[PDB]
Amino acid sequence: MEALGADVTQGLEKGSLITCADNTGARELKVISVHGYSGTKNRHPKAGLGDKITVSVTKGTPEMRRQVLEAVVVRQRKPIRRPDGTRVKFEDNAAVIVDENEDPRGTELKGPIAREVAQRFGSVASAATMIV
Amino acid sequence: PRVELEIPEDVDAEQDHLDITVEGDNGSVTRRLWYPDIDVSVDGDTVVIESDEDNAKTMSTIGTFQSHIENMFHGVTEGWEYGMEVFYSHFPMQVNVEGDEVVIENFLGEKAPRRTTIHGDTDVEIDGEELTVSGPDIEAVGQTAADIEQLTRINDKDVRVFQDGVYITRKP
Amino acid sequence: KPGAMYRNSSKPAYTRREYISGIPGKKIAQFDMGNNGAGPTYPAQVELVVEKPVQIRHNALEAARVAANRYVQNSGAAANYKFRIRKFPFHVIRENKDGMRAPFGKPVGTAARVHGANHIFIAWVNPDPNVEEAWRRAKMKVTPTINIDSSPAGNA
Amino acid sequence: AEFDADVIVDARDCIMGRVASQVAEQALDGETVAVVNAERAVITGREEQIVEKYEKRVDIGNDNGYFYPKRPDGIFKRTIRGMLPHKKQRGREAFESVRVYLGNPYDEDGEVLDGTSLDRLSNIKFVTLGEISETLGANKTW
Amino acid sequence: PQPSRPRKGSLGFGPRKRSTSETPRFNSWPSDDGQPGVQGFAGYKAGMTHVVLVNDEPNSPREGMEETVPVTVIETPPMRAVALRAYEDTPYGQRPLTEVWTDEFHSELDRTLDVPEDHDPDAAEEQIRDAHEAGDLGDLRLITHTVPDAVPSVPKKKPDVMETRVGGGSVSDRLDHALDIVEDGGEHAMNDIFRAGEYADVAGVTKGKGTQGPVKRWGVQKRKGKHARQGWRRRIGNLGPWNPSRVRSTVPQQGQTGYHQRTELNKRLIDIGEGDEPTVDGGFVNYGEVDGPYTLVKGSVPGPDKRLVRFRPAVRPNDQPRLDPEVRYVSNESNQG
RNA sequence: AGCCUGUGUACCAGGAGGGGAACAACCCAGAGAUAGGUUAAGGUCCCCAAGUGUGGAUUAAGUGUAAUCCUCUGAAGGUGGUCUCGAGCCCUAGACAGCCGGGAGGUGAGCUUAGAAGCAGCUACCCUCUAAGAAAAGCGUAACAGCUUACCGGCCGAGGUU
RNA sequence: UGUCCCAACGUUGGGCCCGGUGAACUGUACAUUCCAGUGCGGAGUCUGGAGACACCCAGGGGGAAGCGAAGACCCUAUGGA
RNA sequence: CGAGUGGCUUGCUACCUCGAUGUCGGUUCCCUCCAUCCUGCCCGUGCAGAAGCGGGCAAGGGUGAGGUUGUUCGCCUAUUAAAGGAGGUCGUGAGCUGGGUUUAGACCGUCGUGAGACAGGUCGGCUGCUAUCUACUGGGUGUGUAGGUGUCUGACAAGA
RNA sequence: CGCCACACGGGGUAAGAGCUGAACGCAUCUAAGCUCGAAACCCACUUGGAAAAGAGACACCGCCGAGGUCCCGCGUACAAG
Ligand SMILES: [Cl-]
Ligand SMILES: [Cl-]
Ligand SMILES: [Cl-]
Ligand SMILES: [Cl-]
Ligand SMILES: [Cl-]
Ligand SMILES: [Cl-]
Ligand SMILES: [Cl-]
Ligand SMILES: [K+]
Ligand SMILES: [Mg+2]
Ligand SMILES: [Mg+2]
Ligand SMILES: [Mg+2]
Ligand SMILES: [Mg+2]
Ligand SMILES: [Mg+2]
Ligand SMILES: [Mg+2]
Ligand SMILES: [Mg+2]
Ligand SMILES: [Mg+2]
Ligand SMILES: [Mg+2]
Ligand SMILES: [Mg+2]
Ligand SMILES: [Mg+2]
Ligand SMILES: [Mg+2]
Ligand SMILES: [Mg+2]
Ligand SMILES: [Mg+2]
Ligand SMILES: [Mg+2]
Ligand SMILES: [Mg+2]
Ligand SMILES: [Mg+2]
Ligand SMILES: [Mg+2]
Ligand SMILES: [Mg+2]
Ligand SMILES: [Mg+2]
Ligand SMILES: [Mg+2]
Ligand SMILES: [Mg+2]
Ligand SMILES: [Mg+2]
Ligand SMILES: [Mg+2]
Ligand code: NA
Ligand code: NA
Ligand code: NA
Ligand code: NA
Ligand code: NA
Ligand code: NA
Ligand code: NA
Ligand code: NA
Ligand code: NA
Ligand code: NA
Ligand code: NA
Ligand code: NA
Ligand code: NA
Ligand code: NA
Ligand code: NA
Ligand code: NA
Ligand code: NA
Ligand code: NA
Ligand code: NA
Ligand code: NA
Ligand code: NA
Ligand code: NA
Structure with a gap:
């Protein structure tokens, strides 16, 4: 993909429970895979900010529950390094359900979003309330 | 066996060891004719290819040396020429001679210029959509010509559809 | 199963049906082909000669013959020629299908013992040897290497 | 440096094995031998296969090791080692009193032993130890 | 499975x-x-701090922008080519032919070598030129050594001696270039070989x-x-x-x-200065204060503080040089805390 | 099956010594001590005793340098790789191949079919000019055209073809 | 929640060096081996090659079909219980 | 239908060990094979392109994470350039594990008059040793080359 | 878990694409010759490497003195050494 313009230390793994930062009806998401990622014997597939991951809905509307969708990592608790050296971490881990074209399945994005996410997912970015 | 090749009045052919050289108004070509028990020599007005064996393999080479030498006579006199034709269907291909190597640009819209290095004293004169490879050493010309046509080889797509490229129109 | 298990004439001759039972029928359809109404009144007579004594299971005989005669339809279903496979699968063959205990096998098939040089096939043709080709396909399905021998025919 | 060779043999256009065989014979008889122009000695056959044999030898190995030379220098010498009981006192002596060289570091032109000379005029399928060594990856120091 | x-x-x-x-x-x-x-120089590792730079990369979408980069400080005071060694080409590779030395020796070079008292520079020179005439002259390198004394933070006074190659236009021309350097006193500096912006290969014993x-x-x-x-x-x-x-x-x-030699490839020379502009507050932990000729190397360098490290123009660079990068800030903040 | 079970025989067992890289039973060989000599099997480029032996031929694959064999593989099928021997036919009244020229008309045969003209199908396949030339052997066209085979002549010169 | 991703650093006793004390297991012989081959078909010792200067310290245990136990499995005995 | 190659499976044999060569699966760590799953270079195509399908050379590198099952195998998910197969005493217990196999206890079903049996199922059920030699990783002392200091060379060796 | 660095390009080949070319007047990528062409091979690059028994080279210092060991204060080193 396009450079994120920031170095990331994946803060997530296959099986991690994160927050669904949107109004799709999905509250809690479970990571299932990481797009374009292949690991190494014994290593758990790792995900972080700006990664398109495969997910499954743990919590939310009966209709949305158990559904295997695709999403993007908008926030993580583990720090990330910007070009000026500073680190940046968030209050929680969150992702926003996306479709084939990478357009937020929802209408509104709850909570902030890293700026770096912009440089990769426009329509997601152009839907953000707050962009740090 | 023994074959005697009378050399053209226009020519002078000398030879030391296994190397033969032929010079004419059109140039000079030197070659190595090396095979088991086959002696090549210059007997004044004629070149001699002889050997004591008559087995197939030998007769094959004797015959090969003959056309090789005769071909040299012709190269140093009349010379050798291959004609070619540049052809494109959508992208205007630009063939130019730059230095000691013909260059082809915008082949199938390619940004990267394709090129090949000319062999020996081969002259590649380009005029419009017609090329003319010429020289005294048939070996050099034939290759340069070929190399040129090869230069537009395409394996990825259907040739029948994508036919752009330079081609040998006339063989000497 | 493989020809390897039965292609050698190393066992005793085993053919007395008076002491053998449950012998499978031959797969060979016919022995006389073509114009069997007519007699060998042909100009040319080619033969397929086996070059090593071997055993040929009826399997191979049928497959060989079919592949040859089926091809001889380059001449037509009622063409002018007569084809003959002269050997018959007399030799009964077994298989020990307990381990080596009480291993005398049970009848599983038949095969014909041909000795190097015998002709297994004989065709009769007018100067129209498409038969020579019918045999390059026939020896293709029998164990031994073979010789395609022409007899009455100095029409080369 | 300085080798009182009782005999100086020239390998140029000579069949390595045949030469090597004769050099061992003499070294065992006490003669101090020096082989010259190793880079120019030859071995008949189909280059492709010949090379394969030697490349394999270079590749064969393990912790215990199988040191095989790539220089026409070594090559020639190991060949000679194969023609001597190099592990017996007498054989190590003979082998040690034999040295191969690239080119000719002497003043005298060495001699060409009987039946070891190859006729380039009636022979096209053969190889030069140096060609071999270049293919092995050796550094052409000659 | x-x-x-x-x-x-x-x-x-x-x-x-x-x-x-x-x-x-x-x-x-x-x-x-x-x-x-x-083709090389040396110094003594001192430590690390970051520098802020202007994106020098023409292909970076950030070119021209601020950017923090880690840097290992290395004291690179002048060194001295005390002699020119010549090699000849032989059937067994290269072999040292002779050497041309000098008379002006650093006051403490004898803590390592048995400094020469009687040497014939010309004869050596002659021998070399005759070998070059004959055409058996293999590459040319200068015996070099450092001046630890020049670096206070580094205890050793005993100079470290290492041979460095001299690649030049023609052989005759660079042969001369060699002799000239030597004849003087051998004194040369990082400026003479490297320019801030170029890539160098840093070797060292980990x-x-x-x-x-x-x-x-x-x-x-x-x-x-x-x-x-x-x-x-x-x-x-x-x-x-x-x-x-x-x-x-x-x-x-x-x-x-550990304690293995490593030649780390393509290291960008951020800046070559002099003074105490790079030194940290409190002093470089387990090293000292920097205030003299220094080189700023991008990222890390093999070895612990005080160890000798050697430079050499990258032999296999990937990028084209981007000379004298704009340094907007060098952190002098203490490495303790 | 280095399997199982007979039989005749010699061997190992219980048999040395020589050969076989090593190796109960494969080859020589049946053996008192010591000594000289000549052979056997096997070997004579080196390791290694004796030939870099002689006349002649083949092989270019390092095939091979492997009697026997659990042990040394290599098969059906294929080969204008190469060497040797034979048979038939054609040829200086000029062959085989190649290159050049010719390949003509009644006539685009009849028939069918809108159509068909060498060449969709069916029938026939006749005669003229001539040194040749099909009522066309193969492509090609909607059908023509166009491109060639057959057939003849020329150029060339020696063996060629099955 | 260090079970894992994926390991780090630290603590204490050992381990290592020195004084003192001071066994056992095990031992046909020879023994620096490695790759192949061969052999009663699973060789440091045979055959062919390769490699190999001697001694010593520390290590984790690949091999000695490692040491330990006259196989509990299976069969045999005109055995036992 | 016919000819083969391999030695992963199974079967056969009974040559080797019964004064014991510690049997599955897994794990960890190392080397290899190619009949190539991906990657490189190619050929054909029922090759427009894109996506494929088949084939050639080729073992440098890669070939991963999880849900049930002791399982191997396999079934299934989602990722992936692809998530290839096989050999090394079915590599690896003087390395681990001990779920299973396989003792002594017990239950069920079936069988048996019964003791008790079943490759039928089920719960529980132990993992010894201070390394002599060899091998290798690293570390030293000596001898040889035949006074010392400093700098090198490079036969060869390792690498993905 | 943080940060830095880890090519390209030459050479020869396979499969393959061709050139010239004969046996076989033609034809033919092959028979002799030649031009290309794989992550594979060789070089390049990194590491080790005078015990390479052909046991190496150079410069200087020294053979009644060059240099080294022990000693002392310590480590950019370290289980003894
Ligand atoms: Cl996954
Ligand atoms: Cl090795
Ligand atoms: Cl020996
Ligand atoms: Cl030859
Ligand atoms: Cl007797
Ligand atoms: Cl060979
Ligand atoms: Cl573990
Ligand atoms: K046992
Ligand atoms: Mg695992
Ligand atoms: Mg396509
Ligand atoms: Mg700090
Ligand atoms: Mg701070
Ligand atoms: Mg007995
Ligand atoms: Mg002898
Ligand atoms: Mg062979
Ligand atoms: Mg045999
Ligand atoms: Mg040995
Ligand atoms: Mg017992
Ligand atoms: Mg029992
Ligand atoms: Mg009882
Ligand atoms: Mg064991
Ligand atoms: Mg293959
Ligand atoms: Mg490999
Ligand atoms: Mg196992
Ligand atoms: Mg395994
Ligand atoms: Mg155990
Ligand atoms: Mg073990
Ligand atoms: Mg233990
Ligand atoms: Mg249990
Ligand atoms: Mg259980
Ligand atoms: Mg249980
Ligand atoms: Mg435990
Ligand atoms: Na039974
Ligand atoms: Na057959
Ligand atoms: Na040879
Ligand atoms: Na080797
Ligand atoms: Na007897
Ligand atoms: Na023997
Ligand atoms: Na061979
Ligand atoms: Na813990
Ligand atoms: Na061990
Ligand atoms: Na097989
Ligand atoms: Na035992
Ligand atoms: Na296991
Ligand atoms: Na591979
Ligand atoms: Na599973
Ligand atoms: Na085992
Ligand atoms: Na074991
Ligand atoms: Na255990
Ligand atoms: Na186990
Ligand atoms: Na324990
Ligand atoms: Na414990
Ligand atoms: Na290449
Ligand atoms: Na030495």
């Missing part, structure tokens, strides 16, 4: 034994392109760690799960299969780790 997996550790940096010379020895030299010049386990030494796993409580925590499963009945040298085993 047993999933695949690359082996642990490289089999390229072995045997993993203690280095022979604390002072690094290049086994490669740049190509004879530009004008004649010495930080020694003594004997270590395979886990640390080769990066093999530690026993996992229930296996970690049985009496084995950091020992591999086995030394090899039943057959071949011998332990292969490729299996990760305990031993000397």
Whole structure:
């Protein structure tokens, strides 16, 4: 993909429970895979900010529950390094359900979003309330 | 066996060891004719290819040396020429001679210029959509010509559809 | 199963049906082909000669013959020629299908013992040897290497 | 440096094995031998296969090791080692009193032993130890 | 099924034994392109701090922007080419022919060498020129040494001596270039060889760690799960299969780790200055204060503080040089805290 | 099956010594001590005693340098790789191939079919000019055209073809 | 929640060096081996090659079909219980 | 239908060990094979392109994470360039584990008059040793080359 | 778990694409010759490497003195050494 313009230390793994930062009806998401990622014997597939991951809905509307969708990592608790050296971490881990074209399945994005996410997912970015 | 090749009045052919050289108004070509028990020599007005064996393999080479030498006579006199034709269907291909190597640009819209290095004293004169490879050493010309046509080889797509490229129109 | 298990004439001759039972029928359809109404009144007579004594299971005989005669339809279903496979699968063959205990096998098939040089096939043709080709396909399905021998025919 | 060779043999256009065989014979008889122009000695056959044999030898190995030379220098010498009981006192002596060289570091032109000379005029399928060594990856120091 | 997996550790940096010379020895030299010049220099590692730079990369979407970059400070005071060594080409590779020395010697060069008292510079020079006339002259290199004394933070006074190649235009021309440098007093500096912005290869003898386990030494796993409580925590499963009945040298085993020579490739020379502009508040931990000729190297350099490190124009660079990068800030903040 | 079970025989067992890289039973060989000599099997480029032996031929694959064999593989099928021997036919009244020229008309035969003209199908396949030339052997066209085979002549010169 | 991703650092006792004390297991012989081959078909010792200067310290245990136990499995005995 | 190659499976044999060569699966760590799953270079195509399908050279590198099952195998998910197969005493217990196999206890079903039996199922059920030699990882002392200091060379060796 | 660095390009080939070319007047990528062409091979690059028994080279210092060991204060080193 396009450079994120920031170095990331994946803060997530296959099986991690994160927050669904949107109004799709999905509250809690479970990571299932990481797009374009292949690991190494014994290593758990790792995900972080700006990664398109495969997910499954743990919590939310009966209709949305158990559904295997695709999403993007908008926030993580583990720090990330910007070009000026500073680190940046968030209050929680969150992702926003996306479709084939990478357009937020929802209408509104709850909570902030890293700026770096912009440089990769426009329509997601152009839907953000707050962009740090 | 023994074959005697009378050399053209226009020519002078000398030879030391296994190397033969032929010079004419059109140039000079030197070659190595090396095979088991086959002696090549210059007997004044004629070149001699002889050997004591008559087995197939030998007769094959004797015959090969003959056309090789005769071909040299012709190269140093009349010379050798291959004609070619540049052809494109959508992208205007630009063939130019730059230095000691013909260059082809915008082949199938390619940004990267394709090129090949000319062999020996081969002259590649380009005029419009017609090329003319010429020289005294048939070996050099034939290759340069070929190399040129090869230069537009395409394996990825259907040739029948994508036919752009330079081609040998006339063989000497 | 493989020809390897039965292609050698190393066992005793085993053919007395008076002491053998449950012998499978031959797969060979016919022995006389073509114009069997007519007699060998042909100009040319080619033969397929086996070059090593071997055993040929009826399997191979049928497959060989079919592949040859089926091809001889380059001449037509009622063409002018007569084809003959002269050997018959007399030799009964077994298989020990307990381990080596009480291993005398049970009848599983038949095969014909041909000795190097015998002709297994004989065709009769007018100067129209498409038969020579019918045999390059026939020896293709029998164990031994073979010789395609022409007899009455100095029409080369 | 300085080798009182009782005999100086020239390998140029000579069949390595045949030469090597004769050099061992003499070294065992006490003669101090020096082989010259190793880079120019030859071995008949189909280059492709010949090379394969030697490349394999270079590749064969393990912790215990199988040191095989790539220089026409070594090559020639190991060949000679194969023609001597190099592990017996007498054989190590003979082998040690034999040295191969690239080119000719002497003043005298060495001699060409009987039946070891190859006729380039009636022979096209053969190889030069140096060609071999270049293919092995050796550094052409000659 | 047993999933695949690359082996642990490289089999390229072995045997993993203690280095022979604390002072690094290049086994490669740049190509004879530009004008004649010495192909290397040395200094003494001092430490690390960051510098803020202007994105110099023409292809970066951030080109021209601020950017924080780690830098290892290295004191690179002048060195001295005390003699020109000549090599000849022989059937057995290259061999030292002769050497042209000087008379002006650093007051303490004798703490290492038996400094010359009677040497014939011309004869050597002659011998060399006759070899070049004959055409057997192999490359040319200068014996060089450092002036530890010049670096207060570094205890040693005994100078470190290392040979450095001189690649130049023609051989005759650079041969001369060589002699001239030497004749003077051999005194030369980092400015004479490198320019801030260029890429260099930094060699050095890594930080020694003594004997270590395979886990640390080769990066093999530690026993996992229930296996970690049985009496084995950091020992591999086995030394090899039943057959071949011998332990292969490729299996990760305990031993000397660290204090190995390494030539780290393509290091960008951020800045070559002088003074105390790079020094940190409180002083460079376990080193001291910097206030003299210095080089700022991008990222890390092999070796611990005070160790000698050698430079050389990158022999296999990937990028084109981007001379004299704009330094907007160098942190002098203390390395304690 | 280095399997199982007979039979005749010699061997190992219980048989040395020589050969076979090593190796119970494969080759020589049946053996008192010591000594000289000549052979056997096997071997004579080196390791290694004796030939870099002689006349002649083949092989270019390092085939091979492997009697026997659990042990040394290599098969059906294929080969204008190469060497040797034979038979038939054609040829200086000029062959085989190649290159050039010719390949003509009644006539685009009849028939069918809108159509068909060498060449969709069916029938027939006749005669003229001539040194040749099909009522067309193969492509090609909607059908023509166009491109060639057959057939003849020329150029060339020696063996060619099955 | 360090079971794992994926390991790090630290603590204490050992381990290592020194004084003192001071066993056992095991031992046909020879023994620096490695790759192949061969052999009663699973060889440090045979055959062919390769490699190999001697001694010593530490290590984790690949091999000595390692040491430990006249196989509990299986069969046999005109055995036992 | 016919000819083969391999030595992963199974079967056969009974040559080797019954004064014991520790049997599955897994794990860890190392080397290898190619009949190539991906990657490189190619050929054909029922090759427009894109996506494929088949084939050639080729073993440098890679070939991963999880849900049930002791399982191998396999079934299934989602990722992936692809998530290839096989040999090393079915590599690896003087390395681990001990779920299973396989003792002594017990239950069920079936069989048996019964003791008790069943490759039928089920719960529980132990993992010894201070390394002589060899091998290798690293570390030293000596001898040889035949006074010392400093700098090198490079036969060869390792690498993905 | 943080940060830095880890090519390209030459040479020869396979499969393959061709050139010239004969046996076989033609034709033919092959028979002799030649031009290309794989992550594979060689070089390049990194590491080790005078015990390479052909046991190496150079410069200086020294053979009644060059240099080294022990000693002392310590480590950029380290289980003894
Ligand atoms: Cl996954
Ligand atoms: Cl090795
Ligand atoms: Cl020996
Ligand atoms: Cl030849
Ligand atoms: Cl573990
Ligand atoms: Cl007797
Ligand atoms: Cl060979
Ligand atoms: K047993
Ligand atoms: Mg696992
Ligand atoms: Mg396509
Ligand atoms: Mg335990
Ligand atoms: Mg700090
Ligand atoms: Mg701070
Ligand atoms: Mg007995
Ligand atoms: Mg002798
Ligand atoms: Mg062979
Ligand atoms: Mg045989
Ligand atoms: Mg041996
Ligand atoms: Mg017992
Ligand atoms: Mg019992
Ligand atoms: Mg009883
Ligand atoms: Mg054991
Ligand atoms: Mg293959
Ligand atoms: Mg490999
Ligand atoms: Mg096993
Ligand atoms: Mg395994
Ligand atoms: Mg155990
Ligand atoms: Mg074990
Ligand atoms: Mg133990
Ligand atoms: Mg249990
Ligand atoms: Mg259980
Ligand atoms: Mg249980
Ligand atoms: Na039974
Ligand atoms: Na057959
Ligand atoms: Na040879
Ligand atoms: Na080797
Ligand atoms: Na324990
Ligand atoms: Na414990
Ligand atoms: Na074991
Ligand atoms: Na007897
Ligand atoms: Na023997
Ligand atoms: Na061979
Ligand atoms: Na813990
Ligand atoms: Na062991
Ligand atoms: Na087989
Ligand atoms: Na035993
Ligand atoms: Na196991
Ligand atoms: Na591979
Ligand atoms: Na599973
Ligand atoms: Na075992
Ligand atoms: Na155990
Ligand atoms: Na186990
Ligand atoms: Na290449
Ligand atoms: Na030495």
